[PDB]
Design a protein around this ligand. Structure first.
Ligand SMILES: O=C(CNc1ccccc1)N[C@@H](C(=O)NO)c1ccc(Br)cc1
Ligand SMILES: [Zn+2]
Length: 888
């Protein structure tokens, strides 16, 4: 079945109360469920159909009358059908007893066992794998849940709500009962059982002065890695209080880390469950990246408590209303807490690489799709990250004060209810009306951000009249037709702009957000004393392709002197892109024409001079510096080249990196040495509450320079590499492994770092990733060694994703013209699809650009997707993904 957004219809049934008994045994888990139900005003006498996947039925009843299979109900392992003739006309009880098997549930959806912890994952459609339900988010009910288990193996028992009873059971078993009176959808139900250890704190809310208990749990081995998460939770609570004025409403919040998890974390009410790699860190055993990941993922699930949990989705097509909005709240949080410009830059760099690729691929979809078949395939960077950019533009358009007023309208009008994207637009419209002093002004055009797929292109032309002191910015917007809209309409595009005086680098006009609402417009500015350089889309103010039509000399001057971090970064990006496209076509012609000699256009010398200038600026940001020395991401570049030949791109990037290194390697080396003291400062190495994002950026800059100097084979850099391997920080010593790929000591540092990584589950996975991404000529043999010596038959999604996905970014080797790379990942996708369809679909990520490559590689990748499509046991998830991806 394909579900279409236009076909939403309230249920003809009501579920008022869920009473659950989940009894965990060694070989099986027994779920007894009583559903206090009713007939709704939309009933039309239909069969009572519950969702129920993979359940072994012991018995069902209606009003303590056991139902007979065949004459009274059919169950096909997916839908339980009780025919209307046996369905009461008033308040009735439906009860069932089913058997499920968490120990062998390797799809990690529903109830499953992660190492020695039983844990649930119910969003989107996992609750029906636990018991029968009308498994859809508008079906709101009260929950009363008892869990029993062997007490020695499972001493800690958690579910939603208040623990109201704890009782011993003969046979060394024990039980706990949890009552959660407030209504919730079933995807927010959770249960956890295990030998869990914890850190805890008490938070007192800002206004009600309520005492909230905060618990963070892990397995005993890793309980020393919980401190940052707890700190991040407190920060998230303060931020929503400080920025949005929202307080936590429950008496307890639990965070739980498990080793086996399909995604990052899950916002189950009062019982947030996390991938261990997004909750656990320690400075001895984690790379720097973990600290920003934990901060964002803890924040993200907390912010869901309002945007997702208190204000609910009517239906799954509204997904971006909770995910896009929560990512937006997440990003505002991280920007505030890290206080570095590279936080925002990192979100743009993700959007413009990953999400732009998806939105020009055959998978392109608006942030509110009109249909789906696999609800799990709905969870995408379009829905999340373009969703967040659409959510963020409300704030750009409105400003902080009226944005907060509109957000408050939304929460006040809809708290405790279901909502839709239109509800949010309406709340923002009310704030737009107050801001414009015009109650006729509206945001109806803005709704197209939700329904229109594809990335708008925004282009510029300029005019300066020197005698008139008059400056004109002519703007054009354009979206390519795709499979979702033949004719694209103009969106409401807010363009944050400044005007830079090229003589002194000063701002020429006040804060200004151009509201482009037509396919084209001309914005004129008077009293402009000299010809300015425009600073366009400051902060990346709309999710668009920016065609700035500036000269490289103009872009260099913005890069040196503009006030906005993103426009500086983007101006640099654009200079690189111009060079990349030029040298690419030059390498491509020489290859196509079989030239025996040929020329390459060198990198702009004034550009290199500007990079040196900024690198030598003591007062500049170390994180920003590391962005300017890095060419754009390969998946950003691919949006600008038809039939991209990856070897020619590899040769292009190589030439450009070499050109710049040939001028700046001595600068790179000087800085790498002068940065050591502050970057590797150990003063707070044993304080897990002390987290310094500037210092971590300094290490990123050192590790970026080290990589450049190593690839360049800078004299005696191997000494620096070996000394780096001795650093206490894993970002440093795992960096020493990857950059030693260019040297004969690689396999000596392979063994050294493995021995340092093998005793921590998460640190080993980072090691796997480092090996996987190593720029090695023998990388295929090294992956085979990982498979045989380390990965083996692990079904842990973290292990599989660590071995294979970084490798897929290896431009020369993953795209080896034999197809051996496409064949290797295809085999892994098909093998993984037999037990975890969602992760199988994640492993298809490299294929998303398949139709953007040279015709030979297009054919290689298509052949492999057609082979996976032909596997007789293919999951629905994977089949539907690959059918869409290949346009079938
Ligand atoms: O962990 C992440 C990371 N983001 C993400 C992951 C996959 C696809 C798109 C984005 N997302 C979780 C979230 O949003 N928690 O609040 C989540 C929860 C359930 C389901 Br089904 C899917 C994702
Ligand atoms: Zn989320």
């Amino acid at each position: 079945k394909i579900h279409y957004r236009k076909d939403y219809k309230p249920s003809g049934f009501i579920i008022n109360q869920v009473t659950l008994n989940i009894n965990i045994h060694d070989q099986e888990t027994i779920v007894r469920s009583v559903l206090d139900m009713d007939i709704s005003k939309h009933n039309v006498g239909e069969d009572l159909v519950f969702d129920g996947v993979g359940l072994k039925i012991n018995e069902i009843s209606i009003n303590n009358k056991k139902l007979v299979e065949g004459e009274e109900y059919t169950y096909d392992n997916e839908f339980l059908t009780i025919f209307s003739k046996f369905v009461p006309k008033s308040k009735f009880a439906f009860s069932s007893e089913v058997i499920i098997h968490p120990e062998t549930n390797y799809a990690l959806t529903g109830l499953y066992k992660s190492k020695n912890i039983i844990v649930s994952q119910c969003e989107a459609t996992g609750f029906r794998r636990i018991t029968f339900f009308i498994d859809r988010p508008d079906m709101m009910a009260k929950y009363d849940v008892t869990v029993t288990a062997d007490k020695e193996k499972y001493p800690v028992l958690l579910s939603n709500g208040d623990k109201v009873n704890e009782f011993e059971i003969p046979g060394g078993r024990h039980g706990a009962r949890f009552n959660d009176p407030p209504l919730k959808p079933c995807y927010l139900f959770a249960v956890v059982a295990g030998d869990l250890k914890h850190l805890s704190a008490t938070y007192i809310t800002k206004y009600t002065k309520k005492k909230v208990e905060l618990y963070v749990f892990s397995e005993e081995k890793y309980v020393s890695k919980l401190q940052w998460a707890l700190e991040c939770l407190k920060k998230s609570m303060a931020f929503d209080e400080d920025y949005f004025g929202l307080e936590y409403d429950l008496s307890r919040l639990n965070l739980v880390a498990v080793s086996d998890f399909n995604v990052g974390a899950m916002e189950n009410k009062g019982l947030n469950i996390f991938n261990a790699n997004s909750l656990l860190a320690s400075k001895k055993n984690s790379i720097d990246f973990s600290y920003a990941r934990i901060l964002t993922v803890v924040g993200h699930e907390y912010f869901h408590q309002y945007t997702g949990n208190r204000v609910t989705l009517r239906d799954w097509f509204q997904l971006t209303l909770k995910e896009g909005l929560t990512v937006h709240r997440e990003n505002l949080f991280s920007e505030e807490m890290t206080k570095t410009v590279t936080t925002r830059l990192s979100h743009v760099d993700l959007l413009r690489s990953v999400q732009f690729l998806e939105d020009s691929s055959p998978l392109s979809h608006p942030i509110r799709p009109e249909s789906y078949v696999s609800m799990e395939n709905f969870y995408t960077t379009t829905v999340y990250d373009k969703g967040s950019e659409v959510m963020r533009m409300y704030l750009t358009i409105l400003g902080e004060e009226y944005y907060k007023k509109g957000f408050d309208i939304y929460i006040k009008k809809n708290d405790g209810n279901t909502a839709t994207c239109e509800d949010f637009n309406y709340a923002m419209e009310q704030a737009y009306k107050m801001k414009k002093a015009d109650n006729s002004a509206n945001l109806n055009q803005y709704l197209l951000w939700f329904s229109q797929s594809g990335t708008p292109h925004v282009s510029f032309k300029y005019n300066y009249d020197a005698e008139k002191k008059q400056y004109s910015i002519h703007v054009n917007q354009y979206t390519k037709p795709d499979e979702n809209q033949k004719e694209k309409k103009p969106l409401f595009i807010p363009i944050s702009v400044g005007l830079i005086n090229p003589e002194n680098g000063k701002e020429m006009i006040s804060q200004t957000t151009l509201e482009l609402t037509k396919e084209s417009d001309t914005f004129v500015f008077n009293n402009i004393a000299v010809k300015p350089i425009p600073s366009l889309f400051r902060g990346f103010s709309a999710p668009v392709y920016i065609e700035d039509q500036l000269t490289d000399e103009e872009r260099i001057l913005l890069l040196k002197y503009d006030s906005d971090a993103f426009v500086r970064y983007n101006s640099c990006t654009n200079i690189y892109m111009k060079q990349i496209l030029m040298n690419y076509n030059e390498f491509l012609k020489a290859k196509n024409e079989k030239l025996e000699s040929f020329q390459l256009t060198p990198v702009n010398a004034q550009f290199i001079d500007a990079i040196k200038y900024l690198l030598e600026d003591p007062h500049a940001d170390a994180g920003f510096k590391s962005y300017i020395v890095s060419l754009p991401q390969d998946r950003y570049i691919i949006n600008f080249v038809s039939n991209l030949d990856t070897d020619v791109l590899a040769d292009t990037k190589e030439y450009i990196y070499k050109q710049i290194g040939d001028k700046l390697n001595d600068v790179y080396y000087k800085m790498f040495k002068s940065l050591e003291a502050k970057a590797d400062d150990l003063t707070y190495f044993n304080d897990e509450s002390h987290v310094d994002f500037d210092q971590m950026n300094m290490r990123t800059l050192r590790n970026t320079l080290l990589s450049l100097l190593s690839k360049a084979q800078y004299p005696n850099i191997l000494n620096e590499i070996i000394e780096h391997s001795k650093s206490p920080y894993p970002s440093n010593w795992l960096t020493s492994l990857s950059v030693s790929a260019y040297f004969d000591k690689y396999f000596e540092l392979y063994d050294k770092t493995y021995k340092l990584s093998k005793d921590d589950e998460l640190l080993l996975q980072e090691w796997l990733k480092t090996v996987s991404r190593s720029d090695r000529k023998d990388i295929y043999e090294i992956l085979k060694k990982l498979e045989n010596e380390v990965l083996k038959d692990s079904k842990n999604p973290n292990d599989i994703r660590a071995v294979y996905l970084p490798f897929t970014n290896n431009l020369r080797r993953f795209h080896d013209i034999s197809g051996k790379g496409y064949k290797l990942i295809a085999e892994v996708i098909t093998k993984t699809d037999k037990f975890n369809p969602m992760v199988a679909t994640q492993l298809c990520e490299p294929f998303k650009l398949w139709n953007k490559l040279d015709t030979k590689r297009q054919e290689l990748m298509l052949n492999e997707m057609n082979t996976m499509l032909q596997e007789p046991q293919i999951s629905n998830n994977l089949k539907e993904y690959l059918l869409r991806l290949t346009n079938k």
